[PDB]
Point group: C4
Chain length 334, copies 4
């Protein structure tokens, strides 16, 4: 078997060390745009978000309201695929025909032959294979089928890998963007598979950067899961992630499709995992945080502020200049 | 004194990182058979289990019912030896002439001269010297006696060492399989001897493989104790263990020779250690879990599924392909 | 991005290993004076404190009474700047004209143009640019303006950096002393910037000593925040810090400008961060309560006697000797988690 | 300042890995004797203990009863010096003329000119300078006075250091044995006061290495004592395996009937008093005051502990302490493992 020369780490084990902040670096001048899909060197991505946040492919988070709300702020949602092809297709259509908003859709490696056409006809701007382990022939086959039928006209995100090898496989398979994260989810012990979210992102980004140099193709990567604090967003971006996928964070908003409940005088909101027995056959609570616009605005202002402490006016600048340190276990145990 | 460059670790400190899962790797195609006794390169072991689980050499777990139930599922039990030579021989016989089922039996380094013949005559398929410290002349003497009288016809497992040095000694002594594990057991501080189960397995396996390349003799090793969760099974196997010995896991079952009791409305089963003042002169409660068949089925289904995430259809494949990472203490401390 | 070969640590992760104690090293002979502002090789700083303690630039700790009480013990306070220029200047004046006591003042990188002249006129002995991130052109600009107008006549501390790069920048910019500390404060998660206080001090100090070899200029550094126990003082000094800035420690005293409240039988004092909403509007911080400890004098005396005693276990009669002779070891997380 | 390439550790962070146990390595064949004072190569120590256990220099543990009981088991006690010279001297005399028993006495760097002569006259077999920081001129001066007046006739242990530098200094001053341990005692708040100390295991390991170098350099073997930090019996085996010739314990002995403290019932539990020598009461004839569980007679406890130690030694394939120190395989354990 193969072992590693060092243990994996989570976002909570790192801190950013300030760099030179110039007079022109004010939060208001910070550009949070980022590429969603792969593009060739010297060119621009066919799809660019204004903000680096995307909502999780979950019944408890990415519904119509969320897709529209998040799209309005510059992000994009991936309508959960744990429902019938018609339902999803409809939701996608609804978002597109609201008055245009970008919308994504999750797909599986089983019914893609009939699921993809529907989503495409429905107007989905981008798809993403949904899996806890994307390092497999099924994703290669699924992605290959899509290229076979739509060429580069259909954008499909892929996987969920945690190392260079997994990244490499999906990159060669054709994926437009690759998703990172196994076990870091807040609602994730069972199979004993996973890796610290921070280490997974750092390792995958290094591989992605090599790949770019080798092929001239820049494949955006998404840090999926593990975001507990706003500053985790800044760390994920600083470590190389182009955009971030969150579930819990969004589940707490008014726009999520879960019901608002009250527990012990506190207004909560339901939130369950896609791997739970209820979604797979198409569980917990999170504090109600209010409207998406208000929250997203706050989190990103904090992100923008921090970027300037690091001397960065753009995400690529941050990824280049960021100084990141590990923190001792005792420091965290405070 | 001799010191080590790194601290020893437990199974809870590791995670498996997915490998390439080919379309044909589905739980129903995974072969969980594994060798029980040493054989020559290129050949096969004389004894091969259908599943890599064996029950502990303890009064509270390996009785007649356990031996039959587990053998049915494809594993094997080592009838406890903290009882008269006549009693133990009786059990071995009952199991053998039930209607054939393989059964093991534990022996000690004191009365082996009469215990082994009785056990052998009763039809025991394999023996195992039972000790908390197999790194001793007594085990070498015992194996030497069995060889003197039966040559290679009687298979004898041996030890319980936690490093390459102990493994090498027992290998050269002639052991058919070597058991790993000191201080990792659930019901185990007193003498300050032991090692993290994970490091012990990793270290002994490395030595076992060197021995293989040097002699062409592959000696199976058993990871004994320390299994808290099902995923720990996959890890032990991935680290090189050919089979796993468990006590607590099996004590919880209906087939264990202990009585079922009720404590606070919760049905429990008695479970005490072989080092306790009662087994030696021939303690706690574990939750009742039901039938062995149903539990073993669920655990191994998880193991099979995980093996496929790792791209392995067989145990030897898992041991070769497995990517294993250490986890930060902060991560575990969650 | 740039990564570090080792995790940062806090003061609670270190212990001092004793050195040779001489017959004459007794607390009563230990000299605790330390330099406040940069000076050249072989020389003496123009401002030397009798004790290495200074109070934080916070509304909840450095008011007029604190300034007088701490100056009396040999230290110095930095009157908070989260108030109008007239009020702060008034405070400085009252301290200087009490009956003379040294006093400092915090300034910002925004209104320094008129804030500095007023504070200087009011009689402030030293100023300090107050910020959670001093690694910025604004600090260089502020010091530049000051040097342009008063040359070396006005002493100004600067920053709050946590690494050699930050120090080097502020040093070249002209700072009279550089303050270390981001995220180690007791009332500090949000932006995720910072570094363990011990590592920050150790790294900045190493850079400060290199700078000294290169330029012949010694720049005193201040370990700001993170002091929980008295022995943390000795450690901070041992690691290279010339003086220590504290907020919580002093807020607990009778002389702090905050009111006293009773929380379940215990007498407490209010203590809120300057990054909180209320101070900025004259949220990097919180609003808490620290146990009332009594008079500054008694407490400081108790803490320092502890420091002096430890210094002698280390074989040092002076702070510079300590920084030179100290044997410092990291302790296992298990040892701490006891 | 000076820093270290690695963090210090406590005894709880180590485990022993078995070695080859030969058929003849049985508890009843193990030799636990050990040298108490320095000797020259190829020679033997003028004082050898039958068991590597000595009792702390504390009012709460080393009184007359303790001294007699432990000496009977093959060890030795160091009568506490936080009392008048006449009192301490009387106690020593009592033990020596009980019916002969070896006994030790603690001394300080203040009144030694009058204290040493009295203790020697009373018949003390060995003295030991009692201090929390033995790395000082005062200890060298004290030892220098003793050498001047009695040459090598009077044996005196010294200090309490935690590193090679402190060891070397005391070794050069002329100490007959050196005590290791600062911040490891149970009744200590590992310096929430001064921030001085070092993990006991690392302190013993480091001091031992220097001791062995000093030996190769001078031919003089100086025994070292691991003082404090012993919680479990296996810590005893660890300390010895790490190179300690003998162990000094406070809490361990305080729990016994022979300790000079009172037995008191606390929540149905029979306890015994135990306070540090740096606590306000002993200094007025650093530490805290407390209770420990009553454990009964010293003989029964020391027998059980040492049986366990001997047994473990054989798991490591050692019949003697020097063999253990040579063959022991010691591993650090991950912090996660400890947090179990
Ligand atoms: N990120 C995480 O760590 C994590 C853990 S669970 C989880 C989420 O939970 C949800 C469920 O994930 P999942 O990976 O179990 C689902 P996925 O569809 O990838 O796999 C389920 C199973 O069906 C089988 N399968 C897939 N495609 C085929 C096919 N074409 N033909 C035959 N068999 C096939 C596979 O062997 C697999 O075991 C996901 O939506 C995901 O976002 N994420
Ligand atoms: N795996 C563990 O960490 C662990 C701890 S306790 C434990 C279990 O508890 C049970 C008891 O283990 P154990 O090691 O005490 C048993 P073992 O028989 O090995 O030893 C018991 C004692 O008898 C002595 N002895 C053994 N053979 C002889 C002989 N031929 N001549 C003279 N003396 C002899 C040994 O020195 C030993 O002290 C075992 O069944 C084992 O599985 N396992
Ligand atoms: N040490 C810590 O970790 C820490 C955290 S909060 C904190 C304290 O809280 C208080 C507030 O600190 P702070 O860093 O927010 C203050 P500072 O003045 O440095 O920054 C506040 C904001 O105003 C802007 N700003 C400053 N000067 C100018 C200028 N001249 N022109 C245009 N914009 C400008 C900056 O970009 C910054 O976002 C401080 O007193 C400090 O001691 N310390
Ligand atoms: N092991 C530990 O970590 C530890 C902590 S406290 C402790 C115990 O508590 C007790 C008290 O220890 P301690 O170190 O305070 C005592 P010690 O006598 O060694 O020191 C007390 C002080 O008096 C001074 N002093 C000593 N001799 C003289 C002299 N001759 N003339 C003038 N001044 C002098 C020294 O400077 C010293 O600071 C000890 O018995 C010890 O066993 N052990
Ligand atoms: O049932 C589940 N178990 C574990 N992870 C899940 C499950 N459902 C979704 N996830 C993952 O975790 C993310 C959510 O992360 P979160 O933002 O920490 O709640 C999703 O995008 C998935 O990758
Ligand atoms: O009394 C005992 N103390 C410690 N370990 C024991 C004892 N009896 C058996 N064991 C060991 O621990 C295993 C049990 O591991 P478990 O499955 O974690 O309960 C056995 O096979 C033995 O190797
Ligand atoms: O609002 C705030 N948040 C975090 N730190 C603060 C804040 N206000 C002041 N500080 C810092 O922390 C120090 C106080 O540290 P303390 O002594 O640990 O309470 C000050 O000198 C500042 O550098
Ligand atoms: O008051 C005290 N504080 C801290 N340590 C003490 C004190 N009194 C004695 N000691 C030390 O700690 C040992 C006790 O160790 P213990 O066996 O862990 O209780 C003694 O031999 C001393 O070296
Ligand atoms: C040579 C003198 C330089 C003085 C520098 C003053 C910097 C004050 O700061 C400036 O204040 C303005 C008014 O609030 C703002 O609009 C600017 O954005 C801000 O940078
Ligand atoms: C090239 C960009 C120059 C920006 C300089 C803006 C200066 C704004 O003006 C400044 O505002 C400060 C705050 O009120 C005052 O203290 C200064 O005296 C004043 O000059
Ligand atoms: K900055
Ligand atoms: K896979
Ligand atoms: K000293
Ligand atoms: K052994």
């Amino acid at each position: 078997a193969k072992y590693y020369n060092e243990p994996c780490h989570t976002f909570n084990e790192y801190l950013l060390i300030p760099g030179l902040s110039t007079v022109d670096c004010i939060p208001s001048n910070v550009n949070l745009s980022t590429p969603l899909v792969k593009f060739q060197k010297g060119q621009q991505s066919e799809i660019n978000l204004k903000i680096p946040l995307v909502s999780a492919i979950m019944q408890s988070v990415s519904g119509e309201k969320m897709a529209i709300a998040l799209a309005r702020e510059g992000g994009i949602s991936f309508i959960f695929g744990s429902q019938s092809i018609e339902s999803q297709a409809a939701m996608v259509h609804a978002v597109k025909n609201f008055k245009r908003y970008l919308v994504g859709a999750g797909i599986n490696t089983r019914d893609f032959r009939e699921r993809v056409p529907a989503l495409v006809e429905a107007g989905a701007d981008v798809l993403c294979i949904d899996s806890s382990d994307g390092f497999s022939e099924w994703q290669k086959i699924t992605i290959g089928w899509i290229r076979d039928k739509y060429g580069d006209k259909v954008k499909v995100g892929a996987g969920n890998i945690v190392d260079g090898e997994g990244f490499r496989y999906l990159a060669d398979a054709g994926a437009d963007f690759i998703k990172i994260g196994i076990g870091g989810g807040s609602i994730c012990e069972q199979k004993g598979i996973g890796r610290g979210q921070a280490t997974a992102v750092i390792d995958v980004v290094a591989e992605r950067n090599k790949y770019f140099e080798e092929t001239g193709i820049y494949i955006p990567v998404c840090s999926d899961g593990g975001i507990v604090y706003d500053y985790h967003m800044t760390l994920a971006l600083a470590m190389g992630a182009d955009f971030i996928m969150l579930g819990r964070y969004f589940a707490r908003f008014e726009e999520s499709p879960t019901r608002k409940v009250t527990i012990n005088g506190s207004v909560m909101k339901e939130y369950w995992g896609e791997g739970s027995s209820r979604a797979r056959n198409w569980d917990s609570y999170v504090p109600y945080a209010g409207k998406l616009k208000d929250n997203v605005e706050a989190s990103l202002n904090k992100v923008k502020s921090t970027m300037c402490n690091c001397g960065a006016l753009t995400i690529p600048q941050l990824q280049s200049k960021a100084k990141i340190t590990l923190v001792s276990s005792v420091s965290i145990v405070e």
